[PDB]
Amino acid sequence: TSVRSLAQAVDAYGKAATMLGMPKEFLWGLIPGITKTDVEAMRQHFNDDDEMTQMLLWWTPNGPGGEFAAEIEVDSQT
Amino acid sequence: QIIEAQGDVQKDLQDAQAKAQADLAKQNAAAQQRQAVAV
């Protein structure tokens, strides 16, 4: 029931997760606008085999990363 | 994957080198027997 804005709460929680090392799984339910149903939906579909989740999980500011960015590198090396 | 590719290209390189060396040895043996059989 806090009266904190979304941006402030999100940035503070992210700083806490990155520095104090709090478990990010619990922190998902603390941002306003997200309920327990949303957390359960995130947990159920977080490592799906579809291309969407794989692309959005290994995402970098300069394009998709992970195995998708490793395939082009290994092709170039080969 | 990179190490496997390097190993494969190497392996064919030394396979060709060994085949060439065997052919050279066979040619040298043939030349030696040809020059020795003459008398």
DSSP string, A12-60: HHHHIIIII---HHHHGGGSTT--HHHHHHHHHSSS-SSHHHHHHHSEE
Q: Does B38 touch chain A (CB under 8 A)?
A: no
> Which chain A residues are closer than 8 Å to B8 by Cβ?
none
Instruction: Chain B: give the shortest CA distance to residue A78, in Å.
Output: 6
DSSP reduced 3-state for A62: coil
Tokens of B28: 């040298």
Residue A45 CB-density burial (10 A; 0-12 exposed, 13-18 middle, 19+ buried): exposed
Q: Residue A70's closest chain B neighbor by CA?
A: B1
- CA proximity to A13, closest of A56, A47, A5: A5
Instruction: Specify the experimental method.
Output: cryo-EM
Q: Does B9 touch chain A (CB under 8 A)?
A: no
Tokens of A19: 């520095």
Task: Report chain A's terminal Cα–Cα distance, integer Å.
Answer: 57
